[PDB]
Structure formats: structure tokens, C-alpha cells
Design a protein around this ligand. Structure first.
Ligand SMILES: [Mg+2]
Ligand SMILES: [Mg+2]
Ligand SMILES: [Mg+2]
Ligand SMILES: [Mg+2]
Ligand SMILES: [Mg+2]
Ligand SMILES: [Mg+2]
Ligand SMILES: [Mg+2]
Ligand SMILES: [Mg+2]
Ligand SMILES: [Mg+2]
Ligand SMILES: [Mg+2]
Ligand SMILES: [Mg+2]
Ligand SMILES: [Mg+2]
Ligand SMILES: [Mg+2]
Ligand SMILES: [Mg+2]
Ligand SMILES: [Mg+2]
Ligand SMILES: [Mg+2]
Ligand SMILES: [Mg+2]
Ligand SMILES: [Mg+2]
Ligand SMILES: [Mg+2]
Ligand SMILES: [Mg+2]
Ligand SMILES: [Mg+2]
Ligand SMILES: [Mg+2]
Ligand SMILES: [Mg+2]
Ligand SMILES: [Mg+2]
Ligand SMILES: [Mg+2]
Ligand SMILES: [Mg+2]
Ligand SMILES: [Mg+2]
Ligand SMILES: [Mg+2]
Ligand SMILES: [Mg+2]
Ligand SMILES: [Mg+2]
Ligand SMILES: [Mg+2]
Ligand SMILES: [Mg+2]
Ligand SMILES: [Mg+2]
Ligand SMILES: [Mg+2]
Ligand SMILES: [Mg+2]
Ligand SMILES: [Mg+2]
Ligand SMILES: [Mg+2]
Ligand SMILES: [Mg+2]
Ligand SMILES: [Mg+2]
Ligand SMILES: [Mg+2]
Ligand SMILES: [Mg+2]
Ligand SMILES: [Mg+2]
Ligand SMILES: [Mg+2]
Ligand SMILES: [Mg+2]
Ligand SMILES: [Mg+2]
Ligand SMILES: [Mg+2]
Ligand SMILES: [Mg+2]
Ligand SMILES: [Mg+2]
Ligand SMILES: [Mg+2]
Ligand SMILES: [Mg+2]
Ligand SMILES: [Mg+2]
Ligand SMILES: [Mg+2]
Ligand SMILES: [Mg+2]
Ligand SMILES: [Mg+2]
Ligand SMILES: [Mg+2]
Ligand SMILES: [Mg+2]
Ligand SMILES: [Mg+2]
Ligand SMILES: [Mg+2]
Ligand SMILES: [Mg+2]
Ligand SMILES: [Mg+2]
Ligand SMILES: [Mg+2]
Ligand SMILES: [Mg+2]
Ligand SMILES: [Mg+2]
Ligand SMILES: [Mg+2]
Ligand SMILES: [Mg+2]
Ligand SMILES: [Mg+2]
Ligand SMILES: [Mg+2]
Ligand SMILES: [Mg+2]
Ligand SMILES: [Mg+2]
Ligand SMILES: [Mg+2]
Ligand SMILES: [Mg+2]
Ligand SMILES: [Mg+2]
Ligand SMILES: [Mg+2]
Lengths: 134, 50, 86, 122
RNA sequence: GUUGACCUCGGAUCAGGUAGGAGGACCCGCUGAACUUAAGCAUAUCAAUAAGCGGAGGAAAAGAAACCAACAGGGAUUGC
RNA sequence: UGGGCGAGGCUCCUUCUGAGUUCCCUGGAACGGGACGCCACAGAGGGUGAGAGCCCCGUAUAGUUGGAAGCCAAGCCUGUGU
RNA sequence: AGAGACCGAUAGCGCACAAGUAGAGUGAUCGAAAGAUGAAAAGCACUUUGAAAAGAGGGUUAAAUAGCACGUGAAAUUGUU
RNA sequence: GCGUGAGCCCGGGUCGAACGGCCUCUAGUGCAGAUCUUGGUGGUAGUAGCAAAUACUUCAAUGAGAACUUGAAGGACCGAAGUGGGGAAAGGUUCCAUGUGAACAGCGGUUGGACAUGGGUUAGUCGAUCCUAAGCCAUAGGGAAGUUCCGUUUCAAAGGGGC
RNA sequence: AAACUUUCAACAACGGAUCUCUUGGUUCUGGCAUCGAUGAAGAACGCAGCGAAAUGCGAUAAGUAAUGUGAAUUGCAGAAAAUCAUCGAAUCUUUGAACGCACAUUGCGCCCGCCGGUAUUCCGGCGGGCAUGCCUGUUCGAGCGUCAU
């Protein structure tokens, strides 16, 4: 249950914020879990998804399909996975939009920025665990 | 009339430039709801007030 | 009167006002029927709430007035973030 | 050629910038003239040229205003654009020292009888 | 005698400043109806209201008694 | 009776947050049903292909990473009676 | 900024939409109608008849009697049997 | 199927995401009328009608389709106070070229002032601009609680020529 | 007997009720005090690679600088972030209390300075100025209003 006066449990406000969030907020909204191996390696549970990540689909009709994230369409709150596609009437191939929360990240695109992120998350989680274990 | 002021001529220019159908690629955008130009004006239908 | 007299309608009582843009500037009186130009004060009456709200603040761009709340929130500060190029 | 980064403009003298600006202006101006009569996808380079011109103008203006503020330091009167723009009422209200000025009569009794720190035991 | 003081009154794109408009829910004034009620209607009522005009702020206004009282006396203003 | 510090505290900006997507059935899709687990100072809310605490954002708690220095302040240091 | 024993597209502000908009008036002013395919356009390739609009096959979809005259689809009124 | 009844329940079809019973609480709570409001739809009814301005015809081309497109020919009208050639007000792109499905042109339409895509307005001499008219608005002043009213040269220290 | 009319039923039409939904209203509560001659509110006209409107912006025009984040935007094209957040530096057309005089005119002037045309005088280009009421001060003045030599 919410307590803080700054937090609001209004369904209307929550939906408005979600569906009119700017691109930077949509980045955080479109987070995906890490695989078990990456989670053990980095002590990080979830991260915002990025183009060039390798993911495995764990929900929907395309379960168990793996591939590289080729586009993160924030405007449509979906991602595009390599070879996870569909055919139009003309036979032309179009990507299928997958929500990032329906996939798991099996391999991460890592550059100092993507990593300062992981170090911050790991340090925060470790500190919180230590403080709770005091 | 042939005799026009610059202000009147400028406003006629603006009306002429606004008198057009909407671009086709607009209707292909995600979340688009514009079907047609709803503010279209014709010299025989609706009189513009100068 | 009626149809035959409507054919003599080829003059203009009102032209375009420079202040409000409406075709309400009386061409002979040189006074705007809407905004009261050229009087300094904008014409406004309490018996027309609709007319008041058609031109109250917020119905236009608010080119300058929309930036005041942010400057107030930050305290009308000056200068640059400690450590800025330039 | 193409985009001009603002990072590489802060070290150049006004003259250097104005020169770059000139080239950009010509390039942009020509881009239009050339585009109209030719299939140049560079009809997108006009956005880059316009933004580069804006960047150079911004850098020149910022340098000139910094120099002017340095010049008008410790001067009683400085131009209105250099004067701070808080608010009309804020600029009109009394200064801190004038608002805090008190009479000598008030100052004497404030010196000798201020609000004390006290407690009352139960 | 003229200049020179000082007294008013002026000139100047003189040096530096200030006011206008917006907003006006609330606030301080001015001005000010009639419908209505009275089973009619004129005093009255609506109402010291609506409309009109001037002037502010985050509150405004009021305010440290030419007060209340008549008591064994209270003690600036405001609000419930 | 004048001046100056001032620990320490309250502010402010900023980093960070627990737990299933395990098995079976239906379904285009489980976020439904059944079985077995976990977290809970968090079972507010929202999204995700159907009613999701544990898929994601958030949610609770005082904390914490780094920073600016806005306030208050125990107590100190120091002038001096024309 | 947070809420509700409130209203739920003829309701709720005139306005859930390019609404004080479109439009009317010389003018002061007056002032609407109008939300919903589907999880995803996957928004029907191709063949055939037709001048065309379209039809008939065929295809997509869980579903096309969900086909941009799109959720459901009443009555008045109408056609066929 | 139940109930005297308002109604309640079930079967079948359609459909696609929420909903109901019981006891309390609550109300913007029950429609045939109000020349009720908004919206939709009928009979009338393929009906009234589409009859002022003298009037059309032949061949050919185009086209899916031609009385009202075009060419040629014929027959006619307006008959210089024109159905002619140009302007003022007013309109604002209707002007020109190309193309054209639907809608509009109360019949049709291959045509169009329609729709769509592109073009088109060149001034020292033509106008505006300059002048003053009826008149309007300032100023000095004087009224008015005031929005403002009068005032236009008036109870004003109101300017321009040279070395 | 058909047709026609009517009644009943199935299917198909017409129409948009019903159900469910809701980035919207409405009402209450809490916090805050910040427009403008340093040119506001409002109006006009423009600005995108492909836009008419809405939104945003002002010839630096769907925006520039700066800070933060950290890889997009997306209808197509393109390229090597962003239609991102924040926002302290700037730009900010014609107007508008609107300020040289006007304005139903993109009208007509004056002053200063620079650059050209043989130029203090005319013409052209560029930049900066010229409203009113009032206050303080400055300077130049008027008056037998008045004071001494
Ligand atoms: Mg007449
Ligand atoms: Mg004026
Ligand atoms: Mg507007
Ligand atoms: Mg001066
Ligand atoms: Mg002044
Ligand atoms: Mg005022
Ligand atoms: Mg009576
Ligand atoms: Mg009576
Ligand atoms: Mg009576
Ligand atoms: Mg009274
Ligand atoms: Mg009043
Ligand atoms: Mg208070
Ligand atoms: Mg006060
Ligand atoms: Mg006293
Ligand atoms: Mg008292
Ligand atoms: Mg979490
Ligand atoms: Mg299955
Ligand atoms: Mg759901
Ligand atoms: Mg389950
Ligand atoms: Mg949930
Ligand atoms: Mg409504
Ligand atoms: Mg409706
Ligand atoms: Mg309405
Ligand atoms: Mg009109
Ligand atoms: Mg619908
Ligand atoms: Mg099928
Ligand atoms: Mg159906
Ligand atoms: Mg359906
Ligand atoms: Mg339907
Ligand atoms: Mg029926
Ligand atoms: Mg559904
Ligand atoms: Mg009722
Ligand atoms: Mg009824
Ligand atoms: Mg009845
Ligand atoms: Mg009706
Ligand atoms: Mg009828
Ligand atoms: Mg007939
Ligand atoms: Mg007849
Ligand atoms: Mg006939
Ligand atoms: Mg005839
Ligand atoms: Mg033929
Ligand atoms: Mg004929
Ligand atoms: Mg005749
Ligand atoms: Mg004849
Ligand atoms: Mg004649
Ligand atoms: Mg002619
Ligand atoms: Mg003629
Ligand atoms: Mg005229
Ligand atoms: Mg033509
Ligand atoms: Mg043609
Ligand atoms: Mg017809
Ligand atoms: Mg036809
Ligand atoms: Mg046609
Ligand atoms: Mg043809
Ligand atoms: Mg046209
Ligand atoms: Mg001439
Ligand atoms: Mg001229
Ligand atoms: Mg003159
Ligand atoms: Mg006058
Ligand atoms: Mg006077
Ligand atoms: Mg019967
Ligand atoms: Mg229908
Ligand atoms: Mg409903
Ligand atoms: Mg401005
Ligand atoms: Mg000026
Ligand atoms: Mg000035
Ligand atoms: Mg003139
Ligand atoms: Mg001249
Ligand atoms: Mg020269
Ligand atoms: Mg010159
Ligand atoms: Mg100039
Ligand atoms: Mg001076
Ligand atoms: Mg004198």
C-alpha cells in the first residue's frame, strides 16, 4: 500500500503517464530481465533493453526464439528481433513487435556506459542487502 | 478587386497556401486520426471575412 | 425590401483590426467593435463570460509568460552550471 | 564538410567563427539554389548547414556578451540587456540594505533588550 | 551702472529613473438597477445586489482606543 | 552593549533497492484453472497478446553513493565604556 | 499535487477528437457534430469478369457477418424466402 | 417454467470480458403522451414536379457510354440603352496548361467557374503615395467619481533664415 | 389461382440503441505567489527533406547554446543519438499598453555615425536614435517679482 503523498494510485493518471511518457522515460519503462547466467555474473536483475542486445523470447507465440535486438521502437513500446518476422500478402517480410518484458536478455551489448550502469546497480543492490542484513 | 492592399494580398496568399489536401504520408503514421482536411475552403462555398 | 435590397450590399462597415485581427474595425468610426482599439484598454465586459474567455490569458501562445514558473521554481537564478563549456 | 560541433567553436576567435559562418551561409544558400534544379539527397544537408550557422552565431554572441560583461564589471551603469532580468516587481522592490535599515532609536533598544533565550521550569 | 545673488516660471532627444496594459476567483472604494415579494401598488423588498468605473496583493483590508462598558471592571486588529 | 567562528542537526540535488516467469490443461496469446515454491516495513497503481506481489516500471523503509552549500545551532575565540 | 459511495460519449465543461474549432452574423456576439478494427496491419498477394466502381475465387487472422461504410449491433423502416 | 402482477429463471442463436444472489446503505432510480428534447425512419411516392428568356439539324472524330464534348456544314437569336469590348465596388485564383474514379453541374456528361498536379500578375511616365473638402483625432486648457467629454487655435513663453 | 395488402418466422438491409471500455470532465482537499516600457497578455505572418491543421518555434524559426541521461528517430528517406529530460546562456519577424508622425498606406519624416556614387546639402546601402505625464539633478534662460553695489 502506498503511503507517500507524492505517489498517486490513480488509474487515469498512471495510464496517461505511461502512454504519454517521453522517450527517456520509455527507455526505463522498456526494461528486460537478464538471464540466470548474466544475473549471477553481474548481480543485476533487470536493465533497460538496447539495440544490439541478444534476447530469447519467453512469452507469446514466438517462445524460445532467440536473436539480436535490431530496433527498439519506443513509439510503439516494442522491440524487433532478428528473424522473428512475418509475411504480408505480397510476401514481403516485416518484423514482429515484441514487448521487452516478454523476453530475457541472454547476451548484453557492453560499453563503458552500459557498464557504469551495471556497476551502479550492483553496488546499490549489495549495499541494500548489507543494510538489511545488519 | 484588382486594387488590393498589401495586407489583403498577404491574407489571400495565406488562404491560398492553406487550401490544399493533407499529405498522403501523414495517414501512415502510428496513431494517426486525420482522414482529410477538415478546414478546406472553396471560393464558391464559404466566404472568408477579408 | 428583402431580396432586392440585399443586392445593394457591396460596401464594408468593418475592416480588419490591427490589434485583435477580427473584421470588427468600424471603417468610419475607426474603432474596433471587439477589442476597443485604439483605446489603450482592451474592451471587456462582465456580462459576457464567453467573450471574456475567448480572449483571456492562455488562449494564445504565451511566448513569455509560460517560462516564468520554471524561472521562479529555480529562483530566477543567473549564471551557468558549475562546470559548463563556453 | 558537414556538421560543425560546438565543442570545436569555443576555442576560435570571433573572426574565425564569422569566417566559418560565411562558408556555411554560402554552402546553405547554394545548397537551396543547387537542390531546386537537381536531385541532391543533400536537400537534407540544409538542416545541418542551418544548425551549424545557428551554432556559430550562438558562439559569437556568447563570446561578445562575456567580453561585454567583463568590460562593464565594476561600472555603475551597464546596458539593459546585460542587466539581470528577474521580474518587474522584483527589480522594483527595495534593496536588502534599505529594507533592513532601522532607526537609531530602534537600534539602541534592540542592542540593549533583544529577545532572550529562556526556559521556564515546570 | 552692469553684472552678481534669490524668488517664481520655463527650454533641452540634457543625466538617471518612474507610470500606463494584462489579470481582476478572492480584496479596497465609487456608481448603481429592474425583474421579484408584498397575492394589486407608490414606502418597503430584491439590494446597500447585478451591470458600469477606479486601485492592490499573495492575501488584501483592519489594527494598537477620542473603544467597550457601568462591572469585583475589561483592554490593538481579524476570524469561528 | 561590539565583532568572528562554529561542531552538530534540519534542508536541497544526485546513485541504489524483495521475490517464479518451475511443471501440467485450455487458449492465437495465461495474466485463467491445477500442482509446487518464494518475497512482503513492498498484496497502491499501471503495462505486458485474458483477473500477474515474485515478467517490467513503480510501490515500503529508513538508509546509502557523490555534490552544492540554503538555514538553525550547543559551545568556543576576541574587543570595551569616552 | 492528491483524492471521490460523482458522470460515463444525447452523460460529464460548449469542447474525451486539428473546440471556443468548423460554420452563421456588418457587428456586438452566436456556436456545433464528431471516441472504440485487431494482440499484432498481419489493412487481402495472385487468378478471373468488368470501361470503371466493383464482383467471383483465393489469401491474413482465433475470428472478416472484425475489411478503414471496421467491437457488440436493438427498434422504427425495407428486401427475399 | 414460476408469479395475480410489476417481474424472475431456463433452452437455442449471436457475441466477446466482465457479472450476479442475499442483508444493510445510497440516489441524477422505473415513460406513450408534455404542438416534449436529440437522433433516426416511414406512408404520401417513383407522386408534385424538372413548361419565362423563339431552336435546333446532318456528317465525322473521341469515348464503355454523346441531345446538352469537339470539328465542319446548315438553320437561328442577341441586333450596338447588345447575349459585344473594357472598368469601379465585391470576390480571391474562379485565369492558363495537363489529367480525371467518386461527389457537384435538381437529365446525361468524354465536358466544367468541379476535382487533382503544375504554372501565371514585370511601371520614374497607369494608380496609390502628395494636396485639401465635408468630417475625424491630437495638443493648450476646461469639465467629469471615472470609462472619458468639450476643445482644433481656442485665457499657450507653441517657429525659421543667414554668416 | 396469382398479384396486392396484412400477420407470423428465418436470413439479408437501414440505423446506431444496448453492453463493456475511457490519456476527458466535475467536485473536494493540500502546497505555492511568479505578468509587463529589460516591452506583457493578445493578434498577424512565416519556419520541417517530404505538412494543410494541431503542437512547437522566430530569418540562429518543428529550433541554437549549456547540463543530465546514455543509442535512437521512425510514415518514407537520410545520418552518425534523441520530436529525450532539465534548463541558469542566447536568438526572438510585423505588431500590440506600443513610443518619430501615421496606418483602410508594408505611407511620410528628422538626428548621429559609417560605406559608395565627384558631395555637410542630393541619391543608395548599413547601424544606432527621435512618444507622453511626472520626480531628482544638470545646464541654458525669462520676468522693474525682487536684493546690494
Ligand atoms: Mg444604396
Ligand atoms: Mg495611440
Ligand atoms: Mg488564438
Ligand atoms: Mg535623457
Ligand atoms: Mg520619460
Ligand atoms: Mg491598470
Ligand atoms: Mg406584486
Ligand atoms: Mg401575483
Ligand atoms: Mg404588476
Ligand atoms: Mg438596501
Ligand atoms: Mg460588479
Ligand atoms: Mg495568510
Ligand atoms: Mg496591509
Ligand atoms: Mg496610543
Ligand atoms: Mg479587542
Ligand atoms: Mg524492483
Ligand atoms: Mg496449448
Ligand atoms: Mg489486463
Ligand atoms: Mg495459472
Ligand atoms: Mg500488475
Ligand atoms: Mg458532450
Ligand atoms: Mg453518438
Ligand atoms: Mg455539446
Ligand atoms: Mg462570419
Ligand atoms: Mg463504434
Ligand atoms: Mg476465412
Ligand atoms: Mg457477427
Ligand atoms: Mg466481430
Ligand atoms: Mg459492427
Ligand atoms: Mg425490425
Ligand atoms: Mg477483448
Ligand atoms: Mg429522473
Ligand atoms: Mg418515448
Ligand atoms: Mg401518462
Ligand atoms: Mg424530430
Ligand atoms: Mg419526411
Ligand atoms: Mg409526373
Ligand atoms: Mg411549372
Ligand atoms: Mg418538358
Ligand atoms: Mg424556353
Ligand atoms: Mg468509336
Ligand atoms: Mg440544346
Ligand atoms: Mg426579338
Ligand atoms: Mg434578329
Ligand atoms: Mg450611350
Ligand atoms: Mg471580355
Ligand atoms: Mg462588360
Ligand atoms: Mg471603397
Ligand atoms: Mg478555365
Ligand atoms: Mg479535359
Ligand atoms: Mg445531374
Ligand atoms: Mg451522372
Ligand atoms: Mg465526369
Ligand atoms: Mg473517356
Ligand atoms: Mg479548384
Ligand atoms: Mg500619374
Ligand atoms: Mg510615395
Ligand atoms: Mg500636410
Ligand atoms: Mg476630442
Ligand atoms: Mg484638462
Ligand atoms: Mg394476433
Ligand atoms: Mg448499418
Ligand atoms: Mg455506453
Ligand atoms: Mg518582443
Ligand atoms: Mg523611442
Ligand atoms: Mg522611449
Ligand atoms: Mg490615403
Ligand atoms: Mg526626402
Ligand atoms: Mg562619398
Ligand atoms: Mg544616407
Ligand atoms: Mg534607421
Ligand atoms: Mg546637462
Ligand atoms: Mg533674469
Amino acid at each position: 500500500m502506498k503511503v507517500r503523498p507524492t505517489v498517486s494510485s490513480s488509474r487515469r493518471k498512471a495510464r496517461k503517464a505511461h502512454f504519454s511518457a517521453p522517450s527517456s522515460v520509455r527507455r526505463v519503462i522498456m526494461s528486460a530481465p537478464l538471464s540466470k547466467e548474466l544475473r549471477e555474473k553481474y548481480n543485476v536483475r533487470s536493465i533497460p533493453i538496447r539495440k544490439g542486445d541478444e534476447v530469447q523470447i519467453v512469452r507469446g507465440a514466438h517462445k524460445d526464439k532467440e536473436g539480436k535486438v535490431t530496433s527498439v521502437y519506443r513509439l510503439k513500446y516494442v522491440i524487433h528481433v532478428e528473424r522473428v518476422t512475418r509475411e504480408k500478402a505480397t510476401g514481403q517480410t516485416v518484423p514482429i513487435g515484441i514487448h521487452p518484458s516478454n523476453v530475457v536478455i541472454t547476451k548484453l551489448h557492453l560499453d563503458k556506459d552500459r557498464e557504469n550502469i551495471l556497476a551502479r546497480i550492483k553496488a546499490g543492490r549489495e549495499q541494500v542487502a548489507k543494510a538489511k542484513g545488519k | 478587386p484588382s486594387h488590393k492592399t498589401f495586407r489583403i494580398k498577404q491574407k489571400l496568399a495565406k488562404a491560398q497556401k492553406q487550401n490544399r489536401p493533407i499529405p498522403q504520408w501523414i495517414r501512415l503514421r502510428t496513431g494517426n486520426t486525420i482522414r482529410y482536411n477538415a478546414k478546406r475552403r472553396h471560393w464558391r462555398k464559404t466566404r472568408l471575412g477579408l | 425590401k428583402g431580396t432586392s435590397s440585399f443586392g445593394k450590399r457591396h460596401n464594408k462597415t468593418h475592416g480588419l483590426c490591427r490589434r485583435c485581427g477580427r473584421r470588427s474595425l468600424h471603417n468610419q468610426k475607426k474603432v474596433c467593435a471587439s477589442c476597443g482599439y485604439p483605446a489603450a484598454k482592451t474592451r471587456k465586459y462582465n456580462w459576457s463570460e464567453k467573450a471574456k474567455r475567448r480572449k483571456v490569458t492562455g488562449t494564445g501562445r504565451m511566448r513569455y509568460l509560460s517560462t516564468v514558473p520554471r524561472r521562479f521554481k529555480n529562483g530566477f537564478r543567473t549564471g551557468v552550471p558549475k562546470g559548463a563549456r563556453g | 564538410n558537414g556538421k560543425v560541433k560546438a565543442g570545436q567553436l569555443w576555442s576560435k576567435n570571433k573572426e574565425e567563427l564569422t569566417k566559418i559562418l560565411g562558408e556555411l551561409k554560402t554552402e546553405l544558400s547554394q545548397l537551396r539554389i543547387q537542390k531546386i534544379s537537381s536531385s541532391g539527397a543533400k536537400l537534407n544537408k540544409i538542416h545541418d548547414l542551418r544548425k551549424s550557422i545557428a551554432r556559430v552565431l550562438t558562439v559569437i554572441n556568447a563570446k561578445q556578451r562575456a567580453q561585454l560583461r567583463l568590460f562593464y564589471k565594476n561600472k555603475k551603469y551597464l546596458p539593459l540587456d546585460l542587466r539581470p532580468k528577474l521580474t518587474r516587481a522584483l527589480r522594483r522592490r527595495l534593496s536588502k540594505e534599505d529594507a533592513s535599515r532601522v532607526l537609531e532609536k530602534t537600534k539602541k533598544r534592540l542592542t540593549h533588550f533583544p529577545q532572550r533565550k529562556y526556559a521556564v521550569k515546570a
